[PDB]
C-alpha cells in the first residue's frame, strides 16, 4: 500500500503507546532498515501486514482489534493530513458518503496512480439502514471497515450499529455489513 497508510499506523502507535513502543514494533516487523515512510510512494502490502502482526504481538492485542482502532483513526488522519476538503466533498451524511466512496477513491486515484482501492456498494433498506458490500483485492481488512464506519459516525454525529453478515474469509463471495444509523 502507499506510504501514507504506513505513516498513519506509525502515527497512531506512537501517539497511543509512545516512540519506544513504535520502534519495538518496527524492529519486530523486520523493518529496521526503513528510516521513514514516504507518503506518496508505493510499498509492498507485506510491509503493512508485518506491522500489524508485530503490533499485535507487542501490544498483546488481537490484530483485528488493532484494525478497528486504525479504521477509526484513518478518518481523522486523512482529514488532518491533506485530505480534509476531499472528505468534505464526499458529503455531509453517512449514507451519501458511502455512496460517494468509490468516487472518492477515484479522486484519490488521480494523485496515487497505482492505487488499488476497495469497492463499496450500498443497498438502502430504509431511511435508517443499509447493506454495505465491500470488495477488495486484499484479505483480512473487514475489521478496518468496521472502525472506518464508526469514525464516519463520529464525523457526522450519527449513531451507527454495524454487524457483518457475510465473511469473505469464511467461503463467501465478499464481506457484507448491516448498518443501522440514526441522525
Per rule CB under 6 A, is residue 77 in the interface with ligand HEM?
A: no
Q: Which is nearer to ligand HEM, 51 or 144 (CB)?
A: 144
Per rule CB under 6 A, is residue 174 in the interface with ligand HEM?
A: no
87 binds, among Na ion, ligand HEM, none (CB under 5 to 8 A by kind): ligand HEM
Ranges within 36-75 binding ligand HEM (CB under 6 A): 75
Secondary structure of 75-141 as H, E, C letters: HHHHHHCCCHHHHHHCCCCHHHHHHHHHHHHHHHHHHCCCCCCCEEEEEEEECCEEEEEEECCCCCC
- Taking CB atoms, the residue at the shortest distance from Na ion is 121
Among 127, 137, 157, 170, binds ligand HEM (CB under 6 A): 137
Binding site for ligand HEM (CB under 6 A): 1-2, 4-5, 75, 78, 83, 86-87, 101, 105, 108, 112, 115-118, 136-138, 141, 144-145, 148
Amino acid at each position: 500500500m502507499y506510504g501514507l497508510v504506513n505513516k498513519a499506523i506509525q502515527d497512531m502507535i506512537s501517539k497511543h503507546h509512545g516512540e519506544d513502543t513504535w520502534e519495538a514494533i518496527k524492529q519486530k516487523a523486520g523493518l529496521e532498515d526503513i528510516d521513514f515512510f514516504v507518503g506518496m510512494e508505493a510499498y509492498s502490502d507485506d510491509v503493512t501486514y508485518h506491522l500489524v502482526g508485530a503490533a499485535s504481538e507487542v501490544l498483546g492485542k488481537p490484530a483485528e482489534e488493532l484494525l478497528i482502532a486504525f479504521g477509526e483513526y484513518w478518518v481523522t488522519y486523512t482529514s488532518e493530513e491533506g485530505y480534509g476538503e476531499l472528505l468534505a466533498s464526499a458529503g455531509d451524511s453517512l449514507p451519501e458518503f458511502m455512496e460517494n466512496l468509490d468516487n472518492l477513491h477515484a479522486r484519490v486515484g488521480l494523485s496515487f496512480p497505482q492505487l488499488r482501492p476497495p469497492a463499496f456498494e450500498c443497498q438502502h433498506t430504509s431511511s435508517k439502514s443499509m447493506e454495505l458490500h465491500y470488495q477488495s483485492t486484499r484479505c483480512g481488512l473487514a475489521p478496518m471497515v468496521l472502525g472506518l464506519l464508526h469514525g464516519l459516525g463520529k464525523r457526522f454525529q450519527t449513531k451507527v450499529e454495524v454487524t457483518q453478515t457475510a465473511f469473505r474469509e469464511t467461503g463467501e463471495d465478499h464481506d457484507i455489513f448491516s448498518i443501522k444509523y440514526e441522525d
